[PDB]
Amino acid sequence: SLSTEATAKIVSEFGRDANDTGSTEVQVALLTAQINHLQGHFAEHKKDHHSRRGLLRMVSQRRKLLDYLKRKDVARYTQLIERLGLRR
Amino acid sequence: MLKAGVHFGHQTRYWNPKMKPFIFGARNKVHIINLEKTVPMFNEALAELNKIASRKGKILFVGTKRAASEAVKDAALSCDQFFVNHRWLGGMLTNWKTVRQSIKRLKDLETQSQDGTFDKLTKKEALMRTRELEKLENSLGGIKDMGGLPDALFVIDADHEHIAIKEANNLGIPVFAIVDTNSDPDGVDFVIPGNDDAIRAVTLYLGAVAATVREGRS
Amino acid sequence: SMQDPIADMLTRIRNGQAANKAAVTMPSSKLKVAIANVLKEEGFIEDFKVEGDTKPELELTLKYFQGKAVVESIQRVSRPGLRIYKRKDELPKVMAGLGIAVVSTSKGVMTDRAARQAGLGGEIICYVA
RNA sequence: GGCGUAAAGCGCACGCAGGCGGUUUGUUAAGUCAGAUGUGAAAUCCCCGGGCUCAACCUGGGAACUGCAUCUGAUACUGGCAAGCUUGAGUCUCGUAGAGGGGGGUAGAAUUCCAGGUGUAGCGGUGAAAUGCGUAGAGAUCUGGAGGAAUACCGGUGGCGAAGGCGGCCCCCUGGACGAAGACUGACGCUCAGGUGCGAAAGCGUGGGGAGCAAACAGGAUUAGAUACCCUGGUAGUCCACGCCGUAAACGAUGUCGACUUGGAGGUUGUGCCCUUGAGGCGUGGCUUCCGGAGCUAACGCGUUAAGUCGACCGCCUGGGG
RNA sequence: AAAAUGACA
Ligand SMILES: [Mg+2]
Ligand SMILES: [Mg+2]
Ligand SMILES: [Mg+2]
Ligand SMILES: [Mg+2]
Ligand SMILES: [Mg+2]
Ligand SMILES: [Mg+2]
Ligand SMILES: [Mg+2]
Ligand SMILES: [Mg+2]
Ligand SMILES: [Mg+2]
Ligand SMILES: [Mg+2]
Ligand SMILES: [Mg+2]
Ligand SMILES: [Mg+2]
Ligand SMILES: [Mg+2]
Ligand SMILES: [Mg+2]
Ligand SMILES: [Mg+2]
Ligand SMILES: [Mg+2]
Ligand SMILES: [Mg+2]
Ligand SMILES: [Mg+2]
Ligand SMILES: [Mg+2]
């Protein structure tokens, strides 16, 4: 469920500052880390319908942020989708 | 004039929030009745009353609750005015044409025991009238010396006498009312906040309003 | 979410007088302050205040000539979902001229009695009776 | 114009196109507003006019044809561009309450059945009664064993979930809400046609399981008949795994998202200060039941969780039967 | 326990 140490690593790797939590880059990374870890969970618990609703909120939220970045900084945005790997 | 300060009151935990500009707080989760705001408006109506009492306005005093009942007969019937010490017969003001007939019947009823029907006929039809006399004299008293509709009403409980106000509100009669923490300020245009259900408190009101009636006519 | 903040500003006045409150307070904006300057002119309300730095919060004062209120009918006319613009000869009339209608002409905020006597015209911000 | 009860809110959510969009500064001039230029055939319409003896009827001048295009010029609003701003929305740290979900185990009460021991003549059932069970030992009672389903007490208009709904105890995968103090991102927001997902119980398909209940069915009784209610039995089903179905009085008969507007009695759940002095007292956040003021309206009633005052989008309604 | 029904004006 992306514990604190599992989160304290991504925020520094993607964020611009040691305390830069909240920028568009780090927010997306913290979602794709939950999303691409929850692939294993729903491999086993397939009919976990109630949890799956929470994931579809994560996937939906991520696309909302990436649209905002795409309208803001094209070079920064297309750098982001490849240093993480998505958008196919 | 905050001379005594003996009627903090508070009447309850609940309230009608329409007296928010008339309250403070106390440690018992209950609302302190203002005495600083009370003083100026209180003497306004006394000044107003003296302006109307000089033209013989037939002041009416309404005290119905048991505790303050007797002191109304010590203020209204004391000087010249009228009281309703016991329950208010619904419609006594707007339905005057019917209470008028019953007051006239009373005047016969009292004299039906002076020189009429007390001993010259059967007690089942002579004494029973006195049972109707006693039911009347406390249910309809000092108003027996009236000559029509009054011009100034004076009430103590703005809630316990909320139906006497409406008849007065129905006509044009201005009224002085001693509202409380639980009371309603609207309807009555001459607001006098303060605790009511205390003999040491009512004496402050009645004893210091009947004086203004006294000075109006002289 | 709030989308017509002007329609919010008027409603504070409506409920402020229904509750018989002395004054109201709400966040400030340049169009709002211009609106409140107009109502300061026509005697609907007394002076106002715009104290605020990062939360500029306008603070009006409601007016009671008698026990009653003064702003009897204040309604939003050109809402965002349907905006209406009027021209110099078709300016709306409120209670045969006894009220006013606020028009934001090309030369700043104004009322239909001064824009009519200036040859101008614009969007009908609201009505105030 | 409406949508609690008269016809009318999709069962619930996610969401592309579309609609709408906080606050400041600059700039553009597309919407918008102001003038002119050109065009808007004549007549008919309308104002002041004239001629037939009046009128109907002809006729002169205006005004109107709300329009569309260009040229000038205004910049308050909307839209575009750019730079910010923190209030909206989201992220981070600490902690809280939970029948929220998926999977795997295990306990104890009871019912049924099976193998036995004492034990006698009835048991069971009804408004009465009969069917039925029993001398082949029934019913009652004690011991041992096997199975499936459901979790008494706590338990409460208590809690969680978007809705459907969720209830013994433990474990490990997992979702969302809440609060204090802080830091960051800086419009990233609301709504949603067509789409996508979920969606009680019953039913369906392929396999398992089957104690108790029990549609269908049978016998007894009631009744004028009784294809019923009552009684004795009893099949699918109820239970599990995996795929369907997509409907309910799926109801608060009340779409989602904001802001504003007197009060009481509680519950539950964080919490930050005096009086940690022991109760407590003071505060304030989130959910929730009841009564009620203004207001609303056909009345019932609703009422800070509005059906009150407004703003944005979405669905639906047009006499009853057919 | 049993207790069904009553043309229109
Ligand atoms: Mg999350
Ligand atoms: Mg209608
Ligand atoms: Mg209906
Ligand atoms: Mg619904
Ligand atoms: Mg749909
Ligand atoms: Mg704006
Ligand atoms: Mg233009
Ligand atoms: Mg023409
Ligand atoms: Mg002529
Ligand atoms: Mg702009
Ligand atoms: Mg939505
Ligand atoms: Mg089923
Ligand atoms: Mg089956
Ligand atoms: Mg049966
Ligand atoms: Mg339906
Ligand atoms: Mg339901
Ligand atoms: Mg419905
Ligand atoms: Mg209520
Ligand atoms: Mg027949």
Curated annotation (Swiss-Prot), chain A:
Which source organism does the UniProt entry give?
Escherichia coli (strain K12)
The record's family statement is: Belongs to the universal ribosomal protein uS15 family.
Q: Which NCBIfam families match?
A: S15_bact (TIGR00952)
Q: Does Ribonucleoprotein count among this protein's keywords?
A: yes
Pfam families from the UniProt entry: Ribosomal_S15 (PF00312)
The chain's disulfide connectivity reads: none
**InterPro entries listed in its UniProt record:** Ribosomal_uS15 (IPR000589), Ribosomal_uS15_bac-type (IPR005290), uS15_NS1_RNA-bd_sf (IPR009068)
Q: What does this protein do?
A: One of the primary rRNA binding proteins, it binds directly to 16S rRNA where it helps nucleate assembly of the platform of the 30S subunit by binding and bridging several RNA helices of the 16S rRNA. Binds to its own mRNA, stabilizing it 5-UTR and preventing its translation.
The protein's UniProt keywords, in alphabetical order, are: Ribonucleoprotein, Ribosomal protein, RNA-binding, rRNA-binding, Translation regulation
Q: Name one GO molecular function term.
A: rRNA binding
What induces it, per record? Part of the metY operon that extends to pnp, also has its own promoter.
GO biological processes: cytoplasmic translation; regulation of translation; ribosomal small subunit assembly; translation
**Which GO terms of the cellular component aspect does the record hold?**
cytoplasm; cytosol; cytosolic small ribosomal subunit
Give the matching PROSITE patterns.
RIBOSOMAL_S15
This protein's superkingdom?
Bacteria
Q: How does it assemble?
A: Part of the 30S ribosomal subunit. Forms a bridge to the 50S subunit in the 70S ribosome, contacting the 23S rRNA.
Put simply, this protein is called Small ribosomal subunit protein uS15
> For this UniProt entry, which segments traverse the membrane?
none
UniProtKB/Swiss-Prot annotation, chain B:
Signal peptide annotation? none
Keyword Cell cycle on this protein?
no
Please provide an example of a Pfam family that matches this protein in its UniProt record: Ribosomal_S2
PROSITE patterns reported in the protein's UniProt record: RIBOSOMAL_S2_1, RIBOSOMAL_S2_2
> Cellular component per GO?
cytoplasm; cytosolic small ribosomal subunit
| Keywords, alphabetical | Ribonucleoprotein, Ribosomal protein
Protein family membership: Belongs to the universal ribosomal protein uS2 family.
Protein's job:
Required for ribosomal protein bS1 (rpsA) to bind to the 30S subunit.
Q: Which HAMAP family match?
A: Ribosomal_uS2_B
How it assembles, according to the record, is: Part of the 30S ribosomal subunit, contacts bS1. Some nascent polypeptide chains are able to cross-link to this protein in situ. In collided ribosomes contacts ribosome rescue factor SmrB.
Which NCBIfam families does the entry link to? rpsB_bact
The molecule here is called Small ribosomal subunit protein uS2
